[PDB]
Amino acid sequence: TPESVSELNHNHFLSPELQDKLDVMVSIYSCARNNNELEEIFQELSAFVSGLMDKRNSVFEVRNENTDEVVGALRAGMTIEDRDSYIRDLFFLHSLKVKIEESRQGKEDSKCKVYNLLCPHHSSELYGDLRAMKCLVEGCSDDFNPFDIIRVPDLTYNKGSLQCG
Amino acid sequence: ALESLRGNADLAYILSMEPCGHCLIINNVNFCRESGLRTRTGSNIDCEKLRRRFSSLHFMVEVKGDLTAKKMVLALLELARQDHGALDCCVVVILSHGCQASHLQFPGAVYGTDGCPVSVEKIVNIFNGTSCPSLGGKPKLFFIQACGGEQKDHGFEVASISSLPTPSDIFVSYSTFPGFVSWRDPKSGSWYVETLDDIFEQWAHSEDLQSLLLRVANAVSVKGIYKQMPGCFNFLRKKLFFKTS
Numbered sequence: 001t002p003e004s005v006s007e008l009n010h011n012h013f014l015s016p017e018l019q020d021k022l023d024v025m026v027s028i029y030s031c032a033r034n035n036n037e038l039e040e041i042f043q044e045l046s047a048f049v050s051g052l053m054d055k056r057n058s059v060f061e062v063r064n065e066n067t068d069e070v071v072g073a074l075r076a077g078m079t080i081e082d083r084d085s086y087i088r089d090l091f092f093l094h095s096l097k098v099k100i101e102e103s104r105q106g107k108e109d110s111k112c113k114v115y116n117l118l119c120p121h122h123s124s125e126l127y128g129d130l131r132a133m134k135c136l137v138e139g140c141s142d143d144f145n146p147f148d149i150i151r152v153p154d155l156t157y158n159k160g161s162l163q164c165g
Numbered sequence: 166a167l168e169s170l171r172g173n174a175d176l177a178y179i180l181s182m183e184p185c186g187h188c189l190i191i192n193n194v195n196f197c198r199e200s201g202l203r204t205r206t207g208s209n210i211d212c213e214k215l216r217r218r219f220s221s222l223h224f225m226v227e228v229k230g231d232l233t234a235k236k237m238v239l240a241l242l243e244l245a246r247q248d249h250g251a252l253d254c255c256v257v258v259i260l261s262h263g264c265q266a267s268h269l270q271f272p273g274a275v276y277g278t279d280g281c282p283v284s285v286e287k288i289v290n291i292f293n294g295t296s297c298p299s300l301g302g303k304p305k306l307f308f309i310q311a312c313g314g315e316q317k318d319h320g321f322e323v324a325s326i327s328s329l330p331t332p333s334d335i336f337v338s339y340s341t342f343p344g345f346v347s348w349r350d351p352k353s354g355s356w357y358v359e360t361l362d363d364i365f366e367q368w369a370h371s372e373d374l375q376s377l378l379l380r381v382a383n384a385v386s387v388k389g390i391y392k393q394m395p396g397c398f399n400f401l402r403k404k405l406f407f408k409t410s
Contacts, residue, residue: 053201066206066351109267121276122315122346123262124201144319158203162391164312165205165262165349 002080003060003072004151008091008136011084012152018092025096029114030103038114045096045117049126052089056125056153059086065159072155087133087152093118093126094133123164128157167371171406177373178304178401179253180408186252186303188224189244190215193261193278195231200280206351208260211310211358215258218362222369222407224256234277238287245291249299254405255292256306260358263311265344271398272343275311285309285337294331302329304405306374307337310357314344320392335400338378342394357395360384365407374405 005012014022025041032038059082061073074083097118104110120126132154135141158164171177192212196202212228219226229240241257249255262276266284274282285307291297292305340357341347349355364380375397382395 050199053198121200121202121262121264121280122312123203125203126201127315144317161350162348162389163203163351164346165203165208165355 004153006149012087026099042114055086060155062155068161070156070160090129123158128154177404182253184223184225185254188219188226188256190228190258191232192230196278202262207354210354214362231278233279234281234283237277237283241291245297254304258308260310265314304334310340310355312347313341316345318345318392338397340395348393356385356388369407370409
């Protein structure tokens, strides 16, 4: 319960700063045409994602890797506020990805560099979290769907017994 | 019947010379922080299993670890540049992460250490008759241990003048069906390679390459809660019986 959340609270929604940063990127992305115009937007997300990955490694800890008995946990001297501030930054990525998928309804195969940041590899840490976020926001997802509960920062994803590769 | 069909010009490849040929093994284990790809632990066990295995089959085996995407291409190009006149065969094993791709000929891609892909399409076309003329009418094998796509499979319930074309004699053995994940135990190693080496021990002397990978496909298909279906894109003209002393 301290390490992770099952369902999203009022603390997990976007702040006015993140909401303003989201709306500016969405407006700039759709109205832009050439790949040269998106270089300002690409450098934002790649800076944001690399900052988001550092925020995970400072906040969270994975004990007992490559086993059945894998457990997630918060780092020493790290509060519940530090978790929810990461999940806010994680929500930003999901909600930005949703609106980019709306802007790419026509040509759904452009090979965009900005979109490929929001589609990380299926072994990665961020894929585990974004797939976890998608289940809670968009309702279940129904990929396999057992009795087990979904963790909104999936710390144990691809780190035990069976792994991708 | 068994021994007679081996030594046949029409139905089987001739592997007379010692060694058979070169055997490149790209083994990408440790990937960069920027890509976010997890460290493929237990692939060094799979690497050394195959390294001993192809050495037992009379191949000049050469392992190259943690290659970037550009070094993978330079490593494959330099192999194709060799004089395979005296050589009868050629093998290229690749152990890495993978992904789904907008393919034209062959599905799948394989990542480098830098974390950008090299398509299987591109890897195979390096060894075609135009680019590598020394392997003309010679089997060119490829064993690609990597993920096909992001999708995890649960499966279903079951009750218990001489004419020879440029892309001839290609054989790309896939570890998982295109668009599905390849599974791996950190201690044991990959399901594909663990099952490949075990079957190559027991049935290399009697059975051909296609018959061997049928056992690998069967043995891997029964495994685990999550499922995996290995196969191969066969473009061979004859049966490939591996040589053992």
